[PDB]
Amino acid sequence: NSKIIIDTDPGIDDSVAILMAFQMPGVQVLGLTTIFGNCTTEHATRNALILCEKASHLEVPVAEGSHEPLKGGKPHVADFVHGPDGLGNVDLPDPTIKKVEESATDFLVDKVSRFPGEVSVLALGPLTNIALAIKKDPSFVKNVKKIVVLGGAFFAAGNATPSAEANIHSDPEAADMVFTSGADIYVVGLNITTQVSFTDKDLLELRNSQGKYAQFLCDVCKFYLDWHTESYGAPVIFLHDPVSFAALVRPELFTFKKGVVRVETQGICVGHTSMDMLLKKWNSENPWTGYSPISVAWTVDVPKVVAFVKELVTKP
Amino acid sequence: NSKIIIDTDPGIDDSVAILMAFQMPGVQVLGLTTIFGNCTTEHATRNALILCEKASHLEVPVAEGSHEPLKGGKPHVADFVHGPDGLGNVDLPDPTIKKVEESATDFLVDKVSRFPGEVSVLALGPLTNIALAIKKDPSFVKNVKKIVVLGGAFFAAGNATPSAEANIHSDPEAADMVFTSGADIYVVGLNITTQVSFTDKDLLELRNSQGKYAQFLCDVCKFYLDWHTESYGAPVIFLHDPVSFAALVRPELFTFKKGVVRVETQGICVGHTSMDMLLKKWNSENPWTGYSPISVAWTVDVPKVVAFVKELVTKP
Ligand SMILES: O=c1[nH]cnc2c([C@@H]3N[C@H](CO)[C@@H](O)[C@H]3O)c[nH]c12
Ligand SMILES: O=c1[nH]cnc2c([C@@H]3N[C@H](CO)[C@@H](O)[C@H]3O)c[nH]c12
Ligand SMILES: [Ca+2]
Ligand SMILES: [Ca+2]
């Protein structure tokens, strides 16, 4: 049983990924650590607790994280994507279970130090809690097994601006800190996830299946599909967070390229992820020379990832 | 007949492109406007005059442009690529012809205003002179026939930094000004030019040909080839500027995608070209929404571009 901590802003696709993790054999969810992005951190915390309740996992701790990015200020949330409270149009009563007292930072630090070399972190939102855990404990990057990040856009369009993917754009300083931290990092960007199309047809099939959470997953994905159809002009949704979950437990369905990743933290291209490709020898030193390289998901076996997500969500 | 002005930093591949333009039927070179990049502006001016002499085009004016980018300061020149002199360490006698008195800015403004809708500008270097022409005259963007730009890297690695192509990196403010100006612009980036490989075998065939400028072009390309062999680890050169010349006179050999292009002018990603693909409706305004889209070369018929360059340089 592989120990994982999911740092998340649920969030419609995060909810799919969280329920997939609870349904995944050989995986133990130590806890959910929450962050803003798709919704406010308080809405993310409420949705994480609703998910734990829904999955009969009342014992899985939910530790609330940062309410603001590292630079401070009230975050702009993707409510036009994930609904006013982050759960699309799904009307569910408030959870009875409560968050634990410890912050996401402290929860991350404690579990990694308690089980050194055993815990994998799946980062589904902005990287604020992860950068904060790094700031707090210098042994965190050495003791964390790996960090699988859903974020960035490597030689692909961003979704927050033409240049930036949302999770990175939501906290550029945190992302740059994490990517240069020297931890064993695997980054899954929009270059990968926009290749994995899920259709209106796939959702209707799911609605008509025996999947444990099929009804809820279709109800929650409805707002998500309506927004994608409106914004992209196609009845296709991208399940970014489930795709990164596949990179975490089925990394053989992807190929990874190693290289230094830096994040633009200022200007019009704020949130942009730039990777040094190692194909050209630099005549002069630059912001990418001297850092530890990380792994960036480069290719993806799309039918196999689709089949893997479907297997987990259709499971009775 | 087609009237063109070539803005250039010759430069080894610029020299190939300039001699190709002089060898191109139905093309009239109104003049060469010089800029820094591959070498200092004074070295670029000397090389442009040497090229006009070599080509028996003593009547073609050479107008010297800016010595610094728009933001000021001394530019870093690509002498490791184009030699200390900008011609691959080939010593040539000083030209007898002299530059005209007018600056590149004034030359560009005068010819465009004198022949409205007739003049095409081929931009082979940093875009400083073109930005200065737009700043001086608001009718420039309306009266220039088109601007064909060799610059940027669209969803591809840069060659100045992992994030930026050299011409843009050399003057980011000028590039951002040109790209948002509303002129009819066509941009050919590294995403295109790195697809058009020329080898040590192609250079030996050129030396075996009766090409008018074969001796000179093989002499200057030895430095260019040695640097590519050293930096890229392959006996392959990229003739970026000749490829943009092919986009100018044979645009049917490429496909173009329309989109708004902005340039990062600060931070680690300075010089980065980010294109809004226009496939996603933005929920909020951003630095890419209030501008006229430009055309970005998307695909290229590589054998046809190679054959076109070879035909022009092997021509006795
Ligand atoms: O279009 C979008 N804009 C902003 N965020 C998202 C997301 C969320 N942000 C991440 C992908 O940008 C992912 O974790 C997902 O939960 C999906 N689509 C969009
Ligand atoms: O590797 C390079 N670094 C910087 N500039 C160039 C160039 C010049 N700069 C442009 C392409 O980056 C093009 O106009 C060419 O003349 C070729 N190769 C390199
Ligand atoms: Ca998320
Ligand atoms: Ca050039």
DSSP letter for each residue of A184-247: -EEEE-HHHHTTSEEEHHHHHHHHTS--TTHHHHHHHHHHHHHHHHHHHSSSEEE-HHHHHHHH
Q: Backbone phi, then psi, for A33, in 5-degree steps?
A: -110, 130
Residue B17 near residue B23 (C-beta atoms within 8 A): no
Angle at B65 between CA B63 and CA B68, to 5 degrees: 165
Strand ranges in chain A using DSSP code E only, listed in sequence order:
2-8, 27-34, 62-64, 119-123, 146-150, 185-188, 197-199, 236-238, 254-259, 261-263, 273-275, 294-300
CA distances from A4 to A47, A65, A249, A311, B5 (A): 19, 17, 10, 20, 62
Q: Whose CA is nearest to atom 18 of ligand 2?
A: B81
Cα gap A315→A23, rounded to integer Å: 8
What is the 8-class DSSP label of residue A251?
Answer: G
Residue A172 near residue A271 (C-beta atoms within 8 A): yes
Q: Is residue B9 part of an annotated ligand binding site?
A: yes
Q: Do B268 and A276 lie within an 8 Å CB cutoff?
A: no
Structure solved via: X-ray
Structure-token pair, residue B79: 């002498």
Interface A–B counts its CB contacts (< 8 A) at 93
Cα gap B175→B121, rounded to integer Å: 14
Say if B140 is an interface residue toward chain A (CB within 8 Å).
no
Q: Do A274 and B269 lie within an 8 Å CB cutoff?
A: yes
| Identity of the residue in B268, B277, B279 whose CB atom sits nearest the CB atom of A264 | B268
The candidate with the shortest Cα–Cα distance to A147, out of A179, A177, A170, A169, is A179
Amino acid at A36: F
Residue A179 near residue A293 (C-beta atoms within 8 A): no
Which residues make Cβ contacts (< 8 Å) with residue B93, sequence separation at least 6?
A: none
Chain B nearest C-alpha distance from A71 (Å): 16
What is the resolution in angstroms?
1.9
Say if A287 is an interface residue toward chain B (CB within 8 Å).
yes
Structure-token pair, residue A240: 């970014």
Place of tokens 């033409």: A162
Q: Which 3 state secondary structure label does DSSP give B67? A: coil
Which residues make Cβ contacts (< 8 Å) with residue A51, sequence separation at least 6?
A: A10, A15, A18, A19, A22, A32
| Identity of the residue in B162, B277, B287 whose CB atom sits nearest the CB atom of A274 | B162
The candidate with the shortest Cα–Cα distance to B186, out of B261, B109, B263, is B261
The candidate with the shortest Cα–Cα distance to B239, out of B305, B186, B187, is B305
Cα gap A189→A296, rounded to integer Å: 8
What residues pair up with A83 in beta bridges, in sequence order? none
Sheet holding A119-123, edge to edge: A62-64, A27-34, A2-8, A119-123, A146-150, A185-188, A294-300, A254-259
Residue A296 near residue A154 (C-beta atoms within 8 A): yes
Give the active site residues of B: 240
Cα gap A127→A142, rounded to integer Å: 18
Say if B278 is an interface residue toward chain A (CB within 8 Å).
no
Residue B200 near residue B311 (C-beta atoms within 8 A): no
Angle at B21 between CA B128 and CA B24, to 5 degrees: 155
- Burial label for A180, CB within 10 Å (0-12, 13-18, 19+), is buried
Structure-token pair, residue A84: 């006013």
Closest residue in A to B275 (Cα–Cα): A162
Residue A73 near residue A34 (C-beta atoms within 8 A): no
Residue A65 near residue A92 (C-beta atoms within 8 A): no
Which residues make Cβ contacts (< 8 Å) with residue B129, sequence separation at least 6?
A: B7, B33, B35, B65, B66, B103, B104, B105, B108
Closest residue in A to B266 (Cα–Cα): A267
Distance of alpha carbon A139 from the chain centroid: 23
Name the maximum alpha-carbon separation found in chain A: 60
- Burial label for A17, CB within 10 Å (0-12, 13-18, 19+), is buried
Distance of alpha carbon B240 from the chain centroid: 8
Q: Backbone phi, then psi, for A29, in 5-degree steps?
A: -90, 105
Q: Backbone phi, then psi, for A140, in 5-degree steps?
A: -55, -55
